[PDB]
Design a protein around this ligand. Sequence first.
Ligand SMILES: O=C(O)c1cc(-c2ccco2)n[nH]1
Ligand SMILES: O=C(O)c1cc(-c2ccco2)n[nH]1
Ligand SMILES: O=C(O)c1cc(-c2ccco2)n[nH]1
Ligand SMILES: O=C(O)c1cc(-c2ccco2)n[nH]1
Ligand SMILES: O=C(O)c1cc(-c2ccco2)n[nH]1
Ligand SMILES: O=C(O)c1cc(-c2ccco2)n[nH]1
Lengths: 185, 185, 185
Amino acid sequence: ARTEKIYIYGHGLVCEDVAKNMGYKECIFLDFESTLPKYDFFIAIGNNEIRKKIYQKISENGFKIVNLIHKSALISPSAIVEENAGILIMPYVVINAKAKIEKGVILNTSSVIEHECVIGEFSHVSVGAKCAGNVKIGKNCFLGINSCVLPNLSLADDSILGGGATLVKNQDEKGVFVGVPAKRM
Amino acid sequence: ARTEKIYIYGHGLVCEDVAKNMGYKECIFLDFESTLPKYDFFIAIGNNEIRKKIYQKISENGFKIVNLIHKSALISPSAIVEENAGILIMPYVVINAKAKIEKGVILNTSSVIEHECVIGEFSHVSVGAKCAGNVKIGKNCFLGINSCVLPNLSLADDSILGGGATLVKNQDEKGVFVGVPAKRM
Amino acid sequence: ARTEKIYIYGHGLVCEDVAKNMGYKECIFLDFESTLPKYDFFIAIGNNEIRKKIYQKISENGFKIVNLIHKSALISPSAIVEENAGILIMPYVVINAKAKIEKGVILNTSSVIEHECVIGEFSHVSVGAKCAGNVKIGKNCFLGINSCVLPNLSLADDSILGGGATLVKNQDEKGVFVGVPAKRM
Ligand SMILES: O=C(O)c1cc(-c2ccco2)n[nH]1
Ligand SMILES: O=C(O)c1cc(-c2ccco2)n[nH]1
Ligand SMILES: O=C(O)c1cc(-c2ccco2)n[nH]1
Ligand SMILES: O=C(O)c1cc(-c2ccco2)n[nH]1
Ligand SMILES: O=C(O)c1cc(-c2ccco2)n[nH]1
Ligand SMILES: O=C(O)c1cc(-c2ccco2)n[nH]1
């Protein structure tokens, strides 16, 4: 049962707006804490490795690491969002039927996760990024602003998809995949 | 007057979420049916030619083929959405003043149809795709994920616009228009 | 205190839908007016220089030039939207923590303004365009449909970012920056 207050470990303020939107009445920023009263906890760190290590430590200190899910995000009843798993879901995100979102994932504003996708733990899906149906995003991946991945593709663990970039082919090996930069005329 | 149940002919589950969102209480999947009770009917087939042939046959069997329009889609009062025409409108779609959407069209999640557009019958507008003002999309067109068409342009019947692609010029002849694939670095 | 009617100077109809959505009961299109009853006023002109000159003149005739902000736009409590400044905010726009939107700006449908951005006066942010965190958009800029600007960048006054284009580097000089056109295959 969500507490009335939340510990939140730029991004802080943004996670705070999401927490207020959910109906948290007060947010406490942190930057031995096991002696504090056990309010719900959230880790507002954009970086995949720090999010993970802090997640593991806060968990070991006896806190519940909740999910922050903006009220305007739409999640299919048959989708699976791992419960109390530090998952950030921003405004206007849409997650379709039977998709699965794992622990520590960030789904930023307007991203879309089509039917039957799996978004692996601690991945980062940026603003406007889109994953078509049955896409598998490995753990610790980053999908850039306004990027997208075509249907039925897999992106291996620790990969990076650039701003504006469109993934068209399976990748079972780690990699860095770029789009086109705007050009001065 | 919409029935309490709906026949729906991955995509099924997704159309089912849209139907539940509208307030349908039960969805019946189909994959002689004229002897069945006449609930509302919807065709959850992504493919433009099958959607059409099944549409025509179901119509000839005496069913009403309804539109499924998610409650979060925003449609200008002066826009025209052909009534009971098998049109799928997904979450967060925006259709602006005096636009016209014809029979059998799919408007997927977050697509936007600006003022005075015409989206011709059985076309498919994918997730995040955008049509600027006064754009004419012919019948049986496909606009890829995160694509877009600049203002005042026409795309001829049976054309295809790739993922991520930006249409910049009129096309009065059928064609296939591609964007840039992400490149491994 | 907003009046029940509004003067609105394609785009007219669209601004009218936004005004009705806010709860204006009647819109009056204009295309000596100081002798008219002082309803709220809005300038529905897409062009940055005309918007400005008309803004200045209408202001000098004693009208209040209001902001039109669709109810579905989400604005952080710590964001600053200049009050009664002719700012158009369209459906599903998201403006994050501590961002600042200046006078005469257009934020079109689904654009996103991340934390700590500044969007300078009379700029135009098109449908689906996205500005990442701490981005500074100068005055009279235009950001094309589905474009985007990476984090921590500045775009100098009077610049243009094309449809589909992704800005990757600081620009302290005025310029024109293009994306890739779809190519017939
Ligand atoms: O959980 C809800 O409130 C909800 C979810 C949806 C939906 C999710 C995907 C398509 O529609 N529609 N409503
Ligand atoms: O929305 C976000 O978290 C985000 C993603 C990016 C980015 C950097 C390079 C490509 O996209 N910058 N900010
Ligand atoms: O029909 C409605 O409920 C509605 C539609 C809109 C709108 C449509 C386009 C811009 O605003 N705003 N509200
Ligand atoms: O949202 C959809 O229906 C969709 C569109 C696509 C696609 C395939 C190639 C370019 O976009 N894949 N899925
Ligand atoms: O002002 C509101 O009603 C509101 C704003 C937000 C928000 C803004 C950015 C992220 O969440 N969430 N709710
Ligand atoms: O949404 C709008 O106001 C808009 C922007 C554009 C455009 C023209 C070239 C690149 O984007 N066309 N319409």
